[PDB]
Write a protein that binds this ligand. Structure first.
Ligand SMILES: N[C@@H](CS)C(=O)NS(=O)(=O)c1cccc(-c2cccs2)c1
Ligand SMILES: [Ca+2]
Ligand SMILES: [Zn+2]
Length: 413
């Protein structure tokens, strides 16, 4: 659909380690990721404003690990990401910034492209803009109208189409929150608990009808725009199908977003489980709020690259913590990545070093354990201390360690 970014080289490392075990946010426990021969991943993409902040980075870098660890095990991978190129935050940024919303999003998607290519994240295989996915969303919203799972609000001028929360008996399994806590998040994450004519406070917009002053598209439900959640479950369903191994994104999406996407797809395919694994991750600004230009807490990787930070240092930086930990960027973390990058690059430049077959198996093992990069970086800190301090005799373990750090981690040594 849309052009993504370019793929870095992917060396193949001989051998295999343990199969991936990931934490599933839904079941609140670590279960094995058992994929098919074609392994499938959908990660919620960007809303094209605020370039690539470290929250975006931390997120797509984490699924890079899954992407890469899957490839090393021998799986072929179908990775679909999306762009929310029409969205209410986007319009608010456009109107404040005195710039057109489409011109904004196109330039911001371009900035994301370059930051991902700079960070050596493997591209998705289908890159789908939300505006390029109206037909799929209409075709879906038709099917939930037919099953009564959706309805049209009693508003002839603004005939919004809404999704019944109880359209599905298992609604709430992924998020796990009670109704009181679900309500108060809905209002803080771009939803309408006060919209008149609604059957349930927690029903989610499926098709927002034409408002004056707003872009829109024709449909059997009137003219207007799609809703957020149905966008992603539509693209996910049509490009992959009922057997989705991983659904991932930033942490805010545990609810509403991912809860409702699953609810939509399950209500139309009859499936009980939309995704075998729900995976969430994220960075926060210095203030404990999500990063945004509005808050004055935005750090762009573009600004770090300008500050002269190696893109690999950004990887080691963010990987120094576990992905379900409370990651925070700082000059402290930047220096540990810079020292760690220096230390690793000198060991891999040695003429001969001790055998590495072991430390490769320890790294393959730590990553398969819910992506345990803290313990995987330390095993490499140790193979480096032994090599620099004491030396070895494999004239091949330098290059082998370099190229396995590249394949599995994306770090360029
Ligand atoms: N377009 C939607 C998804 S359909 C969206 O959420 N877009 S986004 O640009 O807000 C975004 C994307 C990826 C990660 C994060 C964050 C992770 C942790 C903190 S923020 C934020
Ligand atoms: Ca659950
Ligand atoms: Zn999404």
């Amino acid at each position: 659909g849309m052009q993504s970014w370019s793929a870095p080289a992917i060396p193949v490392v001989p051998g295999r380690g343990p199969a991936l075990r990931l934490f599933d946010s839904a079941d609140r426990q670590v279960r094995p990721v058992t994929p098919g021969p074609t392994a499938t991943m959908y990660v919620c993409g960007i809303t094209p404003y605020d370039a690539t902040h470290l929250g975006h980075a931390a997120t797509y870098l984490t699924f890079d690990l899954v992407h890469r660890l899957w490839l090393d095990a021998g799986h072929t991978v179908q990775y679909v990401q999306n762009v929310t190129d029409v969205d209410d935050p986007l319009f608010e940024r456009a109107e404040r910034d005195g710039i057109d919303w489409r011109t904004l999003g196109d330039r911001e998607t371009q900035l994301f492209r370059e930051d991902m290519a700079a960070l050596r994240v493997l591209p998705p295989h289908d890159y789908v803009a939300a505006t390029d996915a109206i037909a799929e969303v209409v075709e879906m919203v038709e099917k939930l109208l037919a099953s009564g799972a959706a309805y049209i609000v009693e508003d002839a001028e603004y005939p919004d189409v809404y999704f019944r929360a109880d359209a599905t008996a298992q609604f709430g399994y992924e998020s796990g929150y009670d109704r009181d806590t679900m309500l108060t998040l809905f209002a803080e994450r771009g939803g309408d608990p006060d919209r008149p004519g609604k059957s349930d406070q927690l029903d989610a917009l499926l098709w927002r009808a034409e408002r004056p002053g707003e872009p829109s598209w024709p449909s059997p439900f009137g003219r207007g725009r799609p809703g957020w959640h149905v966008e992603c479950s539509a693209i996910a369903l049509t490009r992959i199908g009922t057997g989705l191994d991983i659904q991932g994104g930033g942490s805010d999406l545990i609810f509403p977003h991912h809860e409702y996407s699953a609810a939509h797809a399950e209500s139309v395919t009859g499936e009980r489980r939309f995704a075998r694994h729900y995976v969430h991750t994220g960075m926060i600004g210095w203030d404990g709020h999500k990063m945004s230009k509005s808050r004055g807490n935005l750090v762009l990787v573009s600004q770090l690259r300008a500050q002269g930070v190696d893109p690999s240092a950004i990887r080691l930086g963010l990987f120094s913590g576990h992905y379900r930990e409370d990651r925070f960027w700082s000059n402290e973390v930047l220096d540990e990545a810079n020292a760690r990058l220096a230390r690793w690059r000198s060991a891999t430049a040695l003429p001969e070093a001790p055998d590495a077959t072991d430390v490769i198996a320890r790294v393959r093992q730590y990553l398969a354990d819910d992506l345990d990069t803290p313990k995987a970086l330390a095993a490499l800190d140790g193979w480096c201390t032994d090599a620099l301090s004491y030396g070895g005799h494999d004239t091949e373990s330098p290059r082998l360690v370099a190229t396995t750090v590249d394949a599995l981690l994306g770090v360029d040594l």
